[PDB]
Amino acid sequence: QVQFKLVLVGDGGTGKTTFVKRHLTGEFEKKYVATLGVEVHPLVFHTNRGPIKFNVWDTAGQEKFGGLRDGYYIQAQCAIIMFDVTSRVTYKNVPNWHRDLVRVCENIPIVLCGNKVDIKDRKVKAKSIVFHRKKNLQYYDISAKSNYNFEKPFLWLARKLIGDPNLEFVAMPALAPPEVVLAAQYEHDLEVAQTTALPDEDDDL
């Protein structure tokens, strides 16, 4: 199985790391801890054409934490450009990220993602999002919080990279799980879990 370098770029606070984490572990990180330089994470999807591995280079959006900056883009095979539909400055900066990206990566599939569509007071109107047209980028409204379209960027990239328009995600095999019981086990750890409230109790699920 071969892997593909994916670089993820965009303004600070747009939800790049949160988006990747959702994909890696299923969690939603509420806190904003700024990425320092880059964090690299392997991410595998199962498809009808076999497994595809992305090596996700999640880069820093804050200028003061930018690290090697375009140095990260070297030998990228695909990319996601992220902005925040509640922050117009982040869309305004999309052409700057794109410029820096394509100067290093001249012919790669790129998805443009407008994150945070769960938020009611949207500032970057749908009608306004047109930058991708002349640059041949795919576009999706997404939300890492509600999972709205969260799989679409990776499904589209996998189709472009494997070169198969009918590639689909498929259910990974479920091996039989084992039987277990250690005679000397004491976890009061359950009582801490019970008395720590679950987050987002107003949510549908």
Binding site: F28, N147, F169, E179, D189, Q194, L198
Partner: protein, 123 residues
């Protein structure tokens, strides 16, 4: 896919959490259909749960007779329990899970079926 040799005893939409003891917080592990599956050759009943869209497994473990469903302080539609061997991410690993449902009715139905499956597994 490895589920053709199993009867689906029960299915319900759920959000699954895992407790991070170090952070002292619950973290979401997946949202989707949680299924109780009985193997036709061993009569053993497991929990198999997959995430929507990606269909990735977020729970895969036997419904052990020794497990007990406990309430969470924040919710009247959730259960928390300790699992000694889940293989969702590969190697067998212990977790403290919390599973939350659309309603109290669904939570209560799940406990009822969870305990039925426990008795099935003892047989």
């Amino acid at each position: 896919t490895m589920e053709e040799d199993e009867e689906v005893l029960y299915k319900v939409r759920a959000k699954l959490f895992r407790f991070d003891a170090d952070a002292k917080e619950w973290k979401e592990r997946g949202t989707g259909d949680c299924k109780f599956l009985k193997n036709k050759k061993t009569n053993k009943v497991r929990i198999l749960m997959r995430r929507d869209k990606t269909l990735k497994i977020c729970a895969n473990h036997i419904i052990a007779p020794e497990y007990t469903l406990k309430p969470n302080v924040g919710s009247d539609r959730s259960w928390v329990y300790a699992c000694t061997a889940d293989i969702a991410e590969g190697e067998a690993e212990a977790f403290t899970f919390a599973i939350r449902f659309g309603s109290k009715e669904n939570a209560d139905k799940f406990k009822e079926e969870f305990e039925k499956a426990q008795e099935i597994n003892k047989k």
